Design a protein around this ligand. Sequence first.
Ligand SMILES: N=C(N)NCCC[C@H](NC(=O)C(=O)[C@@H](CC1CCCCC1)NC(=O)OCc1ccccc1)C(=O)N[C@@H](CCC(=O)O)C(=O)N[C@@H](CC1CCCCC1)C(=O)O
Lengths: 107, 1023
Amino acid sequence: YFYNGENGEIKRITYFSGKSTGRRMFTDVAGFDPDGNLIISTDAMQPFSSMTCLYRVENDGINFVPLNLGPATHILFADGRRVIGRNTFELPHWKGYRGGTRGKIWI
Amino acid sequence: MPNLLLNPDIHGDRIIFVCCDDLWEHDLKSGSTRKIVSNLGVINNARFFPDGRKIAIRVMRGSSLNTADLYFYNGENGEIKRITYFSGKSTGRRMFTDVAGFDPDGNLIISTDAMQPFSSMTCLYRVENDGINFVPLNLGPATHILFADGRRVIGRNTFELPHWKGYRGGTRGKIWIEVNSGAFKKIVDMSTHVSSPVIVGHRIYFITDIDGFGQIYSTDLDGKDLRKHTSFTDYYPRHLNTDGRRILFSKGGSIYIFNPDTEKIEKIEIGDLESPEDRIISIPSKFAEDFSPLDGDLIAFVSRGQAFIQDVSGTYVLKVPEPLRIRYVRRGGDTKVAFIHGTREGDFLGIYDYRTGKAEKFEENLGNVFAMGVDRNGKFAVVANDRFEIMTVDLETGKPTVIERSREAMITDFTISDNSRFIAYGFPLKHGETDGYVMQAIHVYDMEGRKIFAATTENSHDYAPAFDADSKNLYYLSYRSLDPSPDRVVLNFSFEVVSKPFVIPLIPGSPNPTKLVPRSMTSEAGEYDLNDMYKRSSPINVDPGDYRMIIPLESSILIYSVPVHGEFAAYYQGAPEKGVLLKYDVKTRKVTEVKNNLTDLRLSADRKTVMVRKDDGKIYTFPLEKPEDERTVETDKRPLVSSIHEEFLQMYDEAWKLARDNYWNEAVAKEISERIYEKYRNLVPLCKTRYDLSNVIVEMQGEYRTSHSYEMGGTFTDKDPFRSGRIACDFKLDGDHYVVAKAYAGDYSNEGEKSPIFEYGIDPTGYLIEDIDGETVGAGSNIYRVLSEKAGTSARIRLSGKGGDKRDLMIDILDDDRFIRYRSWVEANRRYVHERSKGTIGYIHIPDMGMMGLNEFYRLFINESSYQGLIVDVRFNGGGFVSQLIIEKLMNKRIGYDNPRRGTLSPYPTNSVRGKIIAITNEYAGSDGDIFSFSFKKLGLGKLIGTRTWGGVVGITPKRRLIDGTVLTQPEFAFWFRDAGFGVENYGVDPDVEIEYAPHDYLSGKDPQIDYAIDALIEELRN
Ligand SMILES: N=C(N)NCCC[C@H](NC(=O)C(=O)[C@@H](CC1CCCCC1)NC(=O)OCc1ccccc1)C(=O)N[C@@H](CCC(=O)O)C(=O)N[C@@H](CC1CCCCC1)C(=O)O
């Protein structure tokens, strides 16, 4: 949903009904592109839940443009460069995790 | 766009108010606004405590905001807590169970009728321990309570009356004040209504429209030195509140401040606060109506102004492509359907084809349609409007053609012959202009020749016409088989089962088919002839009863019957009428039951499909041939989609249109309507919630400055109604245990008239309540909340009486105990009157002029009518329409007696009062209550004692709802009294002898009105 502190307006942007659990709260905000557009991360239109692919939100949810960057949890922009966070969500249920799904950052 | 702000309160620089049904706070200093409490339901009042820390809040729950209770908010820790579990009943104009004020110690004083017999009895109570105990102030009904110099100021009926601007009736706001350190004096009693009183310094500020518009006034603690402080013209100011320095209020959706010292008023700048999602989802069934069977086993229906074509399953659903307000939908072809589209200008006929998609929409205005049918051949349609016209609209061209016009009521009961040549319908008529009854005669219009024929005579009520497949006979029903049924309580008789079916052969010489006249012994083959057909009428050998529909078939007749029943639930609770589908075999002449538990029925075109509604509220469909195979119609599979603002604009325009089209005085309407439309329409867009819209609509209704402009029903919240656990007892917190202060009971042998505890053979009075359902209640556990949590079930209650009297019972925890309190009160007054009059005066009380009034009146009349004197108490009488029936009995003069060889005298008439009668009435008796009071005087049945009555006598009979189900009312029936005209409206009735009931009279515990009545009668009984 979008909240506008200017007029107190609230509005639903996605109707993907993304599936989520305690440790995989998927379908969330990924980051914002240089133009100030919201980039979300969801697996709603994917075969596997782990495939939380990146999309650019347009017209308050009218259309979604895929960034085709693969599964990602965070997306940041530095000097026109794309920073990508893979599986970079919190893992409170497993402190000291050192397995293969551990968070990693590409650039 | 901004919001609609309202009902504010102030405390220094902080200002709390309502927006989108939630509670907000604004800081005058910083200029910041924030929501401090939400999701509690609909909040309409918030009051700052003295320390400005806590806040008493009133919230409404239940779909139509029929329930209310109070909550405490603590801005210190953000704590929220429910204080009352009274589940006070409330309506739009009587939002009772609210904050009354604060005593000098800083304690909250509330006003509620929760533990009273009448809703108007909003008595004052001091809240203790967050709702653990409630101490009565015994000051009588009050809306506001203020304290000045140790003196008590009392506001009676001082709540806002937006729905009735310029009100000058007997229930108008008035202010009393204490003077003799215990006595009260009325100090503010203007000709018009006074509301929202407050005190700043040593002056009382309030609102009134004595000058034609709402303004803020003030006077001293003596109701003297009247001053006018404002000169508004845009909207009426409301909800005055203060902190001792400045006055706060709202108007036209904005919040203002008034500084008494400066006499300057300023608007607070708050700006946009909240704008929720506009596109909303609804449950089709909740607002569904006009369910109808189509071809190919399909279903059509209307809901929230939308229309749909679906399969019974509700799996394949099509929405008709048409803007808001589709009043009706009717089968018009294999894949075509006709509909009535409503707009601000009126109603229009439209056609749609759910196969091709085409959907033309005619322009010919039909007026306000209330009935619509289409011929079986799909060429024309028949329509009825509020102009009392019946017409045929060409389904091709669109041109309407009026057939006939009634001058009494609408022609909504009609049918078209299968060969599309005849149109039969009930035609309301009257022999005389000032006739008391409206007759109805069936008429038959012939498309060829274009002439109207009379199917029946005009001496009773003929209805439910129906043609047979071959179009050779016209069957119908009528209430002509007169036979009285005896009344089991009162000497009386009425026509209960006088409905019987009849038939008329369209070909002279042809006999009544149900008669089974051998074909070989008759010579039909004649030709159509509708002349003098009412002479060929013939009854069908079916026992009388109460039939609503007759369906002729090949070798049987289907008849919809309604068994005789009481009207109480239907008149108040609105419960639907239970019917059953009967079958009459023409051959065997035997009758059987095809289906029961019906509350509505519709038949398809081909007479093969049946669609009904049962008492469980669900819609069903079964083939007429095999009624054993019925299916349930589902419509909640696909959500209902709409836009709040578009619906709101739609709803406003209709409320406004109804108010104008139904106002009793046509002349005034044209001016009033056109003058208020724009002003209030500009506030609609500020409305984000249902309640918001309500605030705007009611204010525009008040513009008609008349009574009976109400708003009932509709969906304001998805919150469940507040619950309250009752066992007909009054609790008093004494020490650390709750004690039973009072145990209510009226007639022990009657039903539902006593605390459920009595069934165990003990009077709970004086007893201590240890625990309920194993849980301890007392200084720590709120008994009310506990009870509330058991409402509707039986719980174990440990009791303790004098000595070691220990009880352990499974008491029924009632959801409500008002009636019990009421009957207890009546029986109490009855005893009092008997005792004080030394057994020479009777007592009766009429709670209203509806079904309950009838019950209560005869309940006592049969035992109190034969005393030397009689007191007919009509205080708090909410009206209805049976006053005339009551006056009729009281009118009877005893002129003889019957002497039996063995037994006692029998008076003639039986329903005759034996001696002198005196009537008691107050400012809470209105409508038929006003009528009764005025009539009692005029006819000189006795003296009228009390206080001027309500003053609203313009009847209402709603016939249209809002897409959200709201039921608006419009004063459509102006009551004209001989030698007084409409004078009673906006004034009420003056009693021969006025007897106030001051706050000190309640403190003393004396009923000055009933006492005067007794004494007065005793004096008249000396002759
Ligand atoms: N059919 C029903 N199920 N309900 C209808 C009852 C409505 C009612 N009014 C009254 O008794 C009036 O006296 C009347 C009186 C007149 C005047 C002229 C012509 C005809 C009748 N009657 C009336 O409105 O109804 C019927 C009628 C209409 C057209 C033609 C013939 C009969 C009335 O509501 N009264 C106020 C009276 C207040 C007062 O006494 O000061 C009231 O607010 N009563 C309740 C709340 C309500 C509101 C609506 C319905 C039920 C209860 C209260 O808070 O005390």
